[model samples]
Target: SEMQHASVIAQFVVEEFLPDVAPADVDVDLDLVDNGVIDALGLLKVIAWLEDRFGIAADDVELSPEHFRSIRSIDAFVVGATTPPVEAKLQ
Candidate 1:
């Protein structure tokens, strides 16, 4: 269901940011920047949305362009960041 969740977020981004573009036009693996789907400023907004949506602390991880390259990448980053680490049992 992680993929579905990611897709939902991706859809939201396309709808909110790219109003003129249809949601079906957006692809999970598409190059959001190279294709001009999003600009530098738009990427900032996307990051903000990701932080708010996932309750991620801005300083928690080093933010990078690679992380926000596309919907699939964003999903991978969010899932990895939000998933808590398993604690080991004490002997």
Candidate 2:
């Protein structure tokens, strides 16, 4: 939903994970796991960053692969987490 999150998250990944890769060169859709961009312990740092940065409170169970698959995935997770639920009144 928001482009800024993707850009910012990409920068975070690049700065914290991909030291050699430039922020602009970060492939948001690339498989961080398959590509070995992020590992088990590194993912914890990412989760911690998300918690501190976006204040997203995700349970241990929610720490699934899909949400942390890539930068775009993480961005979408943030968007989904922050995006307020719609309250429709059919009055």
Candidate 3:
């Protein structure tokens, strides 16, 4: 269900956000900015999209290279984020 959102975010990050940088050039294990690819605005777009889509906010403290460095990191963050209340707990 949420995988589509993750894929959209990843595609945006890869194509729209950093068109100049190649996927092969992206060091997912490292800082995207420190590696000279994504910039401040690019990061903001990601944060905003995530916040809006997930109905939560990404505070400044939460916004970091470690979180938005790559598709993998973003995917993990989104998947782990708190979700709305549930009616009951399922097994």
Clashes of each: 0, 0, 0
Question: Where does candidate 2 clash, by residue pair?
Answer: none
Per-model root-mean-square deviation over C-alphas: 6.4, 5.7, 6.9
lDDT of each: 0.65, 0.66, 0.58
For candidate 2, give the lDDT: 0.66
Shift in Å, residue 91, candidate 1 = 32
**Positional deviation of 65 in candidate 1, in angstroms?**
1.6
Clashes of 3: 0
What are the runs in model 3 whose C-alpha is more than 4 Å off? 1-6, 18-37, 83-91
TM-score of every model versus the real structure: 0.71, 0.73, 0.56
Better of 1 and 2 by lDDT: 2
Please, what are the lDDT tens digits per residue for candidate 3 over residues 1-91?
5343544654566775567666565444554455444567766776777678778877634665656455555665666676442321221
- Candidate 3 structure lDDT: 0.58
Clashing pairs in 3: none
**RMSD over all Cα atoms, model 2:** 5.7
Against the true structure, candidate 2 reaches a TM-score of 0.73
The CA lDDT at 85 in model 1 is: 23
Residue 68 accuracy (lDDT) in model 2? 61
